[PDB]
Symmetry: D2
Subunit: 116 residues, 4 copies
Amino acid sequence: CPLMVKVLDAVRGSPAINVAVHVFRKAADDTWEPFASGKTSESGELHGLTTEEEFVEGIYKVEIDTKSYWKALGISPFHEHAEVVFTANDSGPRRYTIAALLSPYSYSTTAVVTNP
Amino acid sequence: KCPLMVKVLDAVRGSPAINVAVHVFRKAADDTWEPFASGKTSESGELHGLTTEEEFVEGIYKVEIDTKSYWKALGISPFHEHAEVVFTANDSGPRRYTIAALLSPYSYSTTAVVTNP
Amino acid sequence: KCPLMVKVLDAVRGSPAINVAVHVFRKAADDTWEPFASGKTSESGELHGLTTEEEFVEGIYKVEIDTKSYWKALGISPFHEHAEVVFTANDSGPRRYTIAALLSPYSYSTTAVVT
Amino acid sequence: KCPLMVKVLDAVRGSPAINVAVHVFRKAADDTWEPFASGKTSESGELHGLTTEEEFVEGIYKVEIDTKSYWKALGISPFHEHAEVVFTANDSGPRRYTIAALLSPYSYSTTAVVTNP
């Protein structure tokens, strides 16, 4: 699990469940080609969408379908989705995880990176 | 601009919090918090003139924001009773401090920015 | 009364970010982003005049903040290439939108305020 | 499991905040905070097994994080003296509590997630 995305719902005080996660990689033609997709559990965490072998150096992008969740929960959201664009494995392999705290019309993204 | 400013924004409505009790305390020689200044948040959420620059001496200060009052009125059950921030003041010169709070029913974030007059 | 305002702060130095490039795009009918506006962040970190109220159509918008450029000079290698904020503007009608982004070398938070 | 857990990160370094002191106080009937539990944040940046469910009671609590000491060790000048989270525990029934804090030299955020076990 080189990449893991954790999603939490602030207003409900419970992990956000059933939000779509989509991962893209920048290609040589500066175009985003799909990399992986996932579905977040009731624990609020989606993992295993990427393996170390498939993961390689490049500029990625993670999309979280925060729009559909709040319609399902009945809230009108401001943000269509959350996008986190970052270079990966610039100097050797590393472990990247992206945490997202979600509210209607407000969200935060934090990334902690460990070498092993 | 006052040396201490407090701004609160609401996540659920995307608007600044209105009518939130804010309390300021100052440390004492006996390590006991003493009341320093109290205010009521406006609709804009920005409060100025709470403490005068001359009456803002170097020391340890605490600012509290009434989280329960805002949410018990609007109808959402709070997780936090209130938000408290503690910091040193006037270590070197009379700087201006701004304390910004992003408010959510079960979360909040606090940031501090300093401006030199 | 600029409908779109971008506010950027630097948590590491506790001061507003200075000399930050910001770009704004609007989605086209071909589902492709097309440049809409751009600017340069001042010392205060608050930007105005990026767009006009009259020329603010009801479409999907994206805001890009050149986080990598800022922290490259300051000497701390940043995690994020940049910051992206995607939203559907003028869903119910004209209004004022404020986008506030708190920056850290390895984290950032975005909050939206409507007048 | 553990009724209350506190998990802390660092923002500028992109690493968990290690060697950070955590102190928990419980409010008394005399409005006096009693030292309830104290711990040190692990290398993973999280603290677990802080309180027993039997020891945990239905009252107002408080969590303190030693922000000042952490930045002194790493060599960066911090703004905040400490981080304080206050809430009402077991208002209705026993539930799991998790308090998350993301630290930066001049800002920090606190989020709380509660689920019925």
